[PDB]
Design a protein around this ligand. Structure first.
Ligand SMILES: *Cc1c(COP(=O)(O)O)cnc(C)c1O
Ligand SMILES: *Cc1c(COP(=O)(O)O)cnc(C)c1O
Lengths: 425, 421
């Protein structure tokens, strides 16, 4: 006999995933296999990092100027993190934001990925039975990260295509009211900026409306800016930290302490296996609580050392960002154009590793049953693994998310060809 | 406007140290740290190996680069190679008397993480776990903070070397019922922190039978299994199952779990390598999904799988580690008796459970706090008061010996002797 969490509290949407695993596509021996376009991973700039590693072997050698510091690292288990790394991190975060804002390293707490940061924040801001508002459509992983062990609930703030899925004052108010009706105390709004799965940076207008709503309701604002480094085209990416500055919110504003940021190196630098997440808050109480909670998911000191060396190289960071935006824009343009050669268009995006594509016109009907229908035809007949919009809780059937940053151009082309032949009927 | 969770000061000794740390050169009268359970005894063996085997830490596997491959590795089942090296090392520690299935092993970011995840998997909020007293003070945070689970003590006393008793178990179980807490299991540290003793076969059988009798779980935190430097032999709970003839047909066979970590034996706490081992498929699956909130860095998993795959190194590290640890413990134990102070006879760990009851102005905890302060402020040593570990009798202290140069240990022993005067 185990706990509720381990048993009856531990779907149709993994159909493409399992179908893919069973028949993975292969350039040579399985050219008709399923192509993976449902994995948000960035494999575009590993050459830049491999190159740097080759010219800078000391980092990964437990060294510092011909000096071994192995023993020192092996012993480092301070929940405040390696100072050098926290400094390099805060600088990198600033550089991503074009140095428009600066971060205090002491308000930054490292976690084993954003997955960890996501949950820890919830543990810090809400008790079981309370709720957090999240704009729809959203990262399906939130349904596990934010609620599994926290007992916290998610109330959706619905967005529709009528306005490019932007956040609305009416949607916010309505979501807040839906929570009250259910007798759930709203503790905050969690936003993904840039957005997964939309692929769009949040507008200043949306940000101001959020800040004012959060200020109005007296709740928190968590900005998951894990994709902040993948904004490859205008409009410019606006970090919530910038908006505070621009709305003239100094530490005298009450809201100034209710705005937090979540970040990670998994999506921009493509290092998900290294488990580097971070929490940033202006509230000392949250930093302290989150710092103690990070003990359940500390970042390997070996990794913290490697990355502090890497991220301390301003020549590399500056160049990685520029090269990463270049390669990502090129790639998105490719997918977007190949998609329209099939008559399919996408939500106009400027960030992320995926496109939110519009396939409503292919729906035999404007129902989610019709969307599941289309999705299956794509899985079984076109042999592509893509994500159905309903997976992300989209309110209108027919939208899909397709990734482009972890596929060789040749494969992307193949997928686009298969799509075109299929649409042909 | 935060959660209840976002809103135990024995850290006194800790603060004073940080403020006034002892130093060989500019602060010879500073406070000496003897309250930190860390093993700094064999880093030379590891540094040596790293030097002769540079490929491991180079994101290289047979002259080729696997950086991208590792950078992308985020499977919550862990790197297969590492899980194999780990299970072999665990077997080797237990003198190959038991073998572990790598698929029943789930990696976590330290034992701290493994501790909590196990609680999340075995008990719901408001339920309880029994823990023998005295115990690792960290349990009070790890097992209850975010889990809402409660700890009910199974008290042990010096009358029998702080061993577990059938009467203490029964009494603890009854204290839980009285409080209307549902007991879900017993958590044991074998070898023990802070006792420094390996659990006896007798204690183990009595635990197995009690747990079997009550129909609850048995979690054996064997994080110190590799530091058992003197007999009696260390007996892993996995061995006792084998010895009590418990195959997978026993119900209890699926209610026995182990927690392990590389932080105390190999001295790698910064790398965050913990592990959960269970025979129950349901726990492994749930724990595997929970590990996503605290996965082990793929860069680290790779380095250690290379290291632990070297049977020449593992075999030699264990032997050398037991050697250096026994030498060190003997030093502290003798220097302590030259002061008239004795310790609980131990054979494992990185610390000694020392008896200083005779120094108490009173057989009270206020007296123990009295003594402890005199030791902190006058003798300038940071040691842990037994009440921190929930010891039921005042006067016991835990002092570490594995992270102090012999010269410093000597200094500490000298200061103690002068004070005892
Ligand atoms: C990919 C992703 C995560 C997980 O990040 P890790 O650092 O791999 O744990 C969390 N949130 C969002 C929105 C993501 O896209
Ligand atoms: C030191 C210790 C821990 C913490 O180990 P980590 O691997 O650093 O998380 C857990 N339990 C006991 C009994 C310990 O002594």
């Amino acid at each position: 006999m185990l706990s509720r969490n381990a048993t009856f509290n531990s779907s149709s949407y993994f159909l493409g995933w399992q179908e893919y695993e069973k028949n993975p596509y292969h350039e040579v021996h399985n050219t008709n296999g399923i192509i993976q376009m449902g994995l948000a991973e960035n494999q575009l700039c590993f050459d830049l990092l491999e190159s740097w590693l080759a010219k800078n072997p000391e980092a990964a050698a437990f060294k510092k100027n011909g000096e071994s510091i192995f023993a020192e690292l092996a012993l480092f288990q301070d929940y405040h993190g390696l100072p050098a790394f926290k400094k390099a991190m805060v600088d990198f975060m600033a550089e991503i934001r074009g140095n428009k804002v600066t971060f205090d390293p002491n308000h930054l707490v490292l976690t084993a990925g954003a997955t960890s940061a996501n949950e820890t924040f919830i543990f810090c801001l809400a008790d079981p039975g309370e709720a957090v508002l999240i704009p729809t459509p959203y990262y399906p992983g939130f349904d596990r990260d934010l609620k599994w062990r926290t007992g916290v609930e998610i109330v959706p703030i619905h967005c529709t295509s009528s306005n490019g899925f932007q956040i609305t004052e009416t949607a916010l108010e309505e979501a807040y009211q839906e929570a009250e009706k259910r007798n759930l105390r709203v503790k905050g709004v969690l936003v993904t900026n840039p957005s997964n799965p939309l692929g769009t940076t949040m507008t200043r207008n949306e940000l101001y409306l959020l800040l004012s709503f959060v200020e109005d309701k007296g709740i928190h604002l968590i900005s998951d800016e894990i994709y902040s480094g993948t904004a490859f085209s205008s409009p410019s990416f606006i970090s919530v930290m910038e908006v505070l500055k621009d709305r003239n919110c100094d530490e005298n504003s009450e809201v100034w302490q209710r705005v937090h940021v979540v970040y990670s190196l998994s999506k921009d630098l493509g290092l998900p296996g290294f488990r580097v997440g971070a929490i940033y808050s202006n509230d000392d109480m949250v930093v302290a609580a989150a710092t103690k909670m990070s003990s359940f998911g500390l970042v390997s000191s070996q990794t913290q050392h490697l990355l502090s060396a890497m991220l301390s190289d301003k020549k590399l960071t500056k160049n990685y960002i520029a090269e990463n935006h270049k390669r990502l824009k090129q790639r998105q343009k490719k997918l977007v154009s190949g998609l329209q050669k099939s008559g399919i268009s996408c939500l106009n995006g400027n960030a992320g590793l995926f496109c939110w594509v519009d396939m409503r016109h292919l729906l035999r009907s404007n129902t989610f049953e019709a969307e599941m229908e289309l999705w299956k035809k794509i899985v079984y007949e076109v042999h592509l693994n893509i994500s159905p919009g309903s997976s992300c809780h989209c309110t209108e059937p027919g939208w899909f998310r397709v990734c482009f940053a972890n596929l060789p151009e040749r494969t992307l082309d193949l997928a686009m060809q298969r799509l075109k032949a299929f649409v042909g009927e």
